[PDB]
Symmetry: D2
Amino acid sequence: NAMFTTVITPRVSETDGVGHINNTTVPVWFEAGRHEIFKLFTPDLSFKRWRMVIIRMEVDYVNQMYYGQDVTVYTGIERIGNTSLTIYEEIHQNGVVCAKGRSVYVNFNFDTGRPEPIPDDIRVKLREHVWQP
Amino acid sequence: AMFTTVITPRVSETDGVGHINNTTVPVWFEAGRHEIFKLFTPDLSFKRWRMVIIRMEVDYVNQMYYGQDVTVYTGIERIGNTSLTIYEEIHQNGVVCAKGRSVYVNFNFDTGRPEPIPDDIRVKLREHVW
Amino acid sequence: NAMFTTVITPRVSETDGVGHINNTTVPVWFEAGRHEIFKLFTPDLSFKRWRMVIIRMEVDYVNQMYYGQDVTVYTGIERIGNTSLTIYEEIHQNGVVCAKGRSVYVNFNFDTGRPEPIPDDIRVKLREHVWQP
Amino acid sequence: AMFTTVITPRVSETDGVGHINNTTVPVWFEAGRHEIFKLFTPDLSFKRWRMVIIRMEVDYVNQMYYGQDVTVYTGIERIGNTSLTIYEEIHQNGVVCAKGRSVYVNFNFDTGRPEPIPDDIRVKLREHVWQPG
Ligand SMILES: [Mg+2]
Ligand SMILES: [Mg+2]
């Protein structure tokens, strides 16, 4: 119920010579779906005040996707850890799941030079976007 | 007349300088050409593709940033015999940031030669001439 | 050992605003490192005769990478299945393992419309490049 | 005088038409500029970056393909006060396939303005002047 929803229009440049969306495009669309999450950690989205660092990703390529039809990225929180969070995410096209992903990010405080227990205000915000399939 | 395409910049589109990287700009211009490609190839199928770029010009007027939407405006400047010239701009925060021209030819991948743009495509393109 | 080695020069457009190589670049570099495997399946690298379809990937981001120094992609065959294979792969910079990956491809025969068991001749040649960590 | 950069094309750099996508050509041109960036900024630190592009043009002469290396030739066509014009070509199979001209300025981010190229950089640039027919 609580996931973020991001509609994207595929581009010719995101295909490859096989005629489908290229596999390296999927992490690009998944990162696009994390936008609202990034915004919770860095409200002005300034790279001066950037906090989010990926440490792991996994993607299952379930069905091929095509240039010419929109896709929808669903992005939710599978686990809120201490200094990390594990995202669950899916890409759909034509109402069919085509890619499923998980990613783990660490909230890194560059000012203090250490991973930072996610502040409480953020945890509350994140709890209302939990998605556990 | 012109097409309007709203895009949400991505972190991967910036570089270490902290702005949108110059190579993103042509990617965004190509995205604004979508409705043009559709006039040439209505089902956007690659087996029926007929567009080949021959020239591109880009003026980078102002820096763009991750975190705010940009808008691509794309229109036809010239419909030539085999080529067409696209005039195109990208705006962020109500400011023109990039201005572009690109030239494509109508291309027949079956015979390997550029080909005159068909009357019925010219007809469809004429609405979108600046 | 027996894995493939691919030296790559990072590009400015591959970094992001945080100032390191962006995470979406790593799967692009891994794919570049699979070049000799693709050639085994499609000797002329023609897309009309393409067969390699990715079905899954995972990446561990061990250390940050930077524009300004080359990287080395090491790509080995971890497993040769029937219709699929598993690739184990790493990216090093400055002599430090910065990313570790696994990917699974299927040999998809676009002519017969379904997955193809890997032909005996490719199987023998793939065996020349196995690497299990 | 010119720099020479050999690049191995990647599957992700093609599109569904079966050839290298036009948006890859500026990415390859930016890679050929690497040693020019180094003249401005020896250690390629983003903290000390100076170059901002103001204009680019590309002539696409012949289509390029995945599966054969390409070579980028890059030289300085003119050194202005605050700007320089770079002339660049990309070759595949011994044939010129793209020609480019780009204009960068030396930019001060601390003051937010282009500024005269300093004498010590100008001295370096003069050695890489390339002005073809
Ligand atoms: Mg592509
Ligand atoms: Mg980038």
